[PDB]
Amino acid sequence: FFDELRIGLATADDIRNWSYGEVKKPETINYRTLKPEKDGLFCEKIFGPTRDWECYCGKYKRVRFKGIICERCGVEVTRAKVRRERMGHIELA
C-alpha cells in the first residue's frame, strides 16, 4: 500500500507504456450523429466504451461474457468507468 510518492521525468517508453493505443485522427465526434470518431479523440477502442458494457460496434453488448475484444470495432467490452482511467499517446513525427 501507499508509503511514499515518487515523481520523476517520463521517458518515451513510460508514455508508450501508460497508453492503450496511438491516436492519429484530428476527429473528436460527429456533430451530426453525435459519436466519437475512430483513431481520433473520444474513441472507444483505446479509451473504453461510453455506454456501460457495450462495444462501439454495439453487437456483443451482454455482460455474460467478459474479457474479449470485438474484432470489428476492437472495443473490449467492459465498464465505461475506464474512460477516466485510460490513456493513449501520439508518436509525434
Binding site: T11, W18, L41, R84, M87, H89, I90, E91, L92
Partner: peptide, 15 residues
Amino acid sequence: PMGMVLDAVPVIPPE
C-alpha cells in the same frame, strides 16, 4: 535528461 525532449506525447482521458 532525455525526458526533457519528447518523441511521444500523451493524451488525457476524455472525462
